[PDB]
């Protein structure tokens, strides 16, 4: 309230601000116990770590990947499930192993130097830390170490250095949790899950179609590019159900949760331009290493692949599980949401002054202008919606709107007070994906061309 200086200046060295953008907040359904709420919104990884999240933990990796995109959003939604324990699997090979573990606001970095021997040494080292033993627990088995927190304590485990997995187990099922999560907040668009079992993915895909959300998943499976006859992967599983979900194969999808990169390359992209994902670069992802046949198999199974070309990295073909391009799905959702929002906003403003709308021919037609404002015109201006006359079919692409008259409304609707049968039409544009060229080279003197000067005739006259 009281200012001691007429003019004051805060000199921040190095840092810079960033403008406020409009975007769709993604949701990452992680399993943990750091807070009681079902869903929280964060604006930076600093806030997440301040809430007890361990560096390198799944949620932290997802957030740091999401915030690094060219179209990254400025908020991230973190879901919450129950947690029973966690695993640190050393299957594979590894010289120095570092595991970041945080227990009840206490941060420590256990260290270690055949996988079974490394796991046993790590388990012994964990028990050496008296603080960890009092509040947490560790046990060795095979190539993985299982750690569990004492009931009144919260433990978070995240990647440090070395090669290993981090897998969290929970009794709560995604199908049971999502209906509760949506109740707290419906203000999010993208859907992602930490659990990577087939059943969880199928449940998320079924839920998303019903609740109008976009589902993303990275599979890290090796059957994803198996010969076409081997219909045994999750990608082929989703095809049979005709579900829609942007799935892609990768190698680090279970150590980094690279869904963040895709979301950051998709969050702040306005669907009105019809801007496909064909060649968008994404930080964090690693190029696909298979050969030509493997790529052909992956394409046949609709598993998108990140490929490196001419020194850079590029997504490819942006296809979904059902075979439809993700761009079309996003455009359809955009139209569906914004036509409704515009109409509702006009109706509410019209009924907030009195003089609410009435079902008569003298007031209905204004819906034409109301709808031609907002989506139908922004789409044309930004190039998403096509217009003009078609020369091949001899048809026009002009958007059309039709409104029924009062005499055609059945008496029942006048009691229900709801109008039906409003019709709209549109024509979607298309991006360019592939190009093929035909070149030619000449070595000797090219042969003299025909010297005909007539105007080329269109077609032969002989016809009966």
């Amino acid at each position: 309230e009281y200012q001691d200086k007429v003019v004051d200046v805060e000199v921040s060295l190095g840092t810079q601000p960033i403008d406020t953008v409009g975007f769709e907040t993604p949701m990452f359904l992680a399993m943990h116990g750091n807070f009681p709420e079902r869903i929280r919104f964060y604006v930076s990884t600093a806030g997440m770590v301040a809430d007890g999240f361990a560096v390198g933990s799944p949620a932290y990796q997802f957030a740091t990947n999401a915030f690094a995109g060219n179209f990254a959003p400025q908020r991230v939604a973190i879901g919450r499930m129950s947690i029973d324990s966690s695993k640190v699997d050393f299957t594979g090979t590894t010289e120095q192993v570092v595991v970041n573990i945080t227990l009840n606001k206490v941060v420590k970095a256990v260290k270690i130097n055949t996988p079974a021997q490394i796991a046993t040494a790590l388990a012994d080292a964990v028990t050496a830390d008296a603080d960890l033993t009092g509040k947490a627990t560790a046990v060795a088995t095979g190539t993985y170490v299982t750690v569990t927190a004492v009931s009144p304590n919260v433990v978070s485990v995240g990647k440090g250095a070395g090669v290993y997995k981090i897998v969290n187990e929970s009794s709560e099922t995604v199908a049971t949790v999502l209906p509760s999560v949506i109740a707290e907040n419906h203000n999010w668009y993208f859907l992602a899950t930490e659990a990577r079992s087939d059943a969880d993915i199928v449940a998320a895909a079924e839920f998303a179609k019903a609740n109008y959300k976009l589902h993303i998943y990275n599979s890290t499976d090796v059957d994803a590019y198996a010969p076409e006859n081997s219909a045994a992967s999750v990608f082929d599983t989703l095809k049979s159900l005709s579900y829609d979900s942007l799935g892609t194969s990768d190698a680090g999808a279970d150590v980094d949760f690279t869904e963040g990169s895709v979301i950051g390359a998709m969050a702040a992209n306005d669907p009105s331009y019809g801007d496909s994902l064909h060649l968008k670069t994404m930080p964090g992802m690693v190029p696909f290493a298979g050969s030509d046949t493997q790529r052909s198999n992956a394409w046949s199974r609709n598993a998108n692949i990140y490929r490196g070309l001419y020194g850079g990295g590029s997504y490819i073909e942006g296809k979904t599980s059902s075979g439809q391009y993700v761009d079309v799905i996003r455009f359809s959702h955009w139209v569906k949401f914004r036509m409704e929002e515009s109409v509702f906003a006009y109706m509410k403003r019209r009924s907030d002054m009195g003089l609410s709308m009435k079902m008569s021919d003298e007031d209905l037609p204004v819906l034409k202008s109301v709808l031609m404002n907002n989506p139908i015109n922004i789409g044309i201006r930004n190039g998403g919606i096509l217009t003009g006359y078609d020369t091949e079919n001899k048809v026009s692409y002009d958007p059309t709107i039709i409104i029924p008259k009062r005499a055609n409304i059945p008496t029942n609707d006048l009691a229900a007070r709801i109008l039906r049968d409003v019709k709209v039409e549109l024509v979607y544009n298309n991006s360019l994906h592939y190009v093929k060229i035909r070149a030619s080279v000449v070595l000797d003197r090219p042969a003299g061309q025909s010297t005909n000067a007539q105007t080329p005739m269109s077609s032969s006259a002989v016809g009966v």
């Binding site: 044309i380 201006r381 217009t387 003009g388």
Partner: protein, 154 residues
């Protein structure tokens, strides 16, 4: 194809602000308020007999800023007095700033180059002061900047 509106707002001449020394100028003429012109071409071209082409940049950014005011405007006195004050004391430079409504802007140092002629007649007269500018580079104040790294080629 449908006609597109080139802007959302409307170009309002009153929104163009001219700040000479930290004060807003008022009492402008009828048709044109200010005109900004560069003295010399940006790039010169040397063409050889064989056809070889070479170019050299120009570092002369001096320009002239015409300023039209009604002879009844009070700002005529301010500039007239400042002319003699600078002539006596020897300090002629002063900041100049222009804010565009839906166009480019300008912010540099300037000075008074020539005093306009004065004529008395049946109608109210007009005076077109000429103000020099150290640099006549019109700078943008828009979302421009994300595409300048796209047009680049060769």
């Amino acid at each position: 194809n449908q006609s597109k509106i080139l802007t959302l707002q409307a170009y309002d001449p009153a929104k163009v602000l001219v700040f000479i020394g930290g004060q807003r100028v008022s009492g402008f003429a009828a048709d044109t308020k200010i005109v900004i012109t560069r003295n010399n071409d940006n790039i010169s071209v040397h063409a050889g007999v064989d056809g070889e082409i070479s170019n050299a940049l120009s570092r002369d950014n001096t320009g002239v800023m015409t300023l039209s005011l009604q002879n009844t405007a009070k700002w005529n006195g301010y500039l007239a007095q400042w002319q003699r004050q600078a002539n006596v004391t020897g300090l002629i430079y002063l900041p100049v700033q222009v804010e565009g409504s839906q166009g480019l802007s300008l912010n540099t140092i300037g000075w008074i180059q020539k005093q306009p002629d004065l004529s008395y007649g049946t109608e109210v007269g007009q005076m077109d002061w000429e103000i020099g500018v150290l640099d006549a580079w019109l700078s943008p104040d828009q979302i421009q900047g994300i595409a300048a790294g796209i047009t680049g080629l060769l």
